[PDB]
């Protein structure tokens, strides 16, 4: 399902809830139209890979989570597994999410 992380504290809890399941994190800015506009593929895929947990993160309302990763640009997607970061990339490319998920699935 989809989980919105409004704080780094919840980010740690969500990583633990995913367990060994893949975990994608979107740092898109909700205030940025181009970034939020690309969320349908990220959010829509949640049911495409229900065996994968998708997290949505606001660099503005969830800046504590983004500051931890030192995000230098949005939208940025980060992959976590067992609470371990194994991949990250930037650029408004929704299809790229499909390949990276396939890569870490």
């Amino acid at each position: 399902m989809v989980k919105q992380i409004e704080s780094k504290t919840a980010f740690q809890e969500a990583l633990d809830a995913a367990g060994d399941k893949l975990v994608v994190v979107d740092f898109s800015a909700t205030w940025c139209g181009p970034a939020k506009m690309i969320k349908p593929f990220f959010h829509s895929l949640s049911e495409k890979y229900s065996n994968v947990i998708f997290l949505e993160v606001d660099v503005d309302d969830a800046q504590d989570v983004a500051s931890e990763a030192e995000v230098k640009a949005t939208p940025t997607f980060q992959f976590f597994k067992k609470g371990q970061k194994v991949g990250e990339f930037s650029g408004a490319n929704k299809e790229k999410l499909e390949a990276t998920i396939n890569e870490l699935v």
């Binding site: 800015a29 940025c32 181009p34 660099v59 640009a73 939208p75 650029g91 408004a92």
Partner: peptide
């Protein structure tokens, strides 16, 4: 220097 595909943090928000 500004790419529509990317949002810059230089933004006050």
């Amino acid at each position: 220097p500004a790419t529509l595909k990317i949002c810059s943090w230089n933004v006050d928000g």
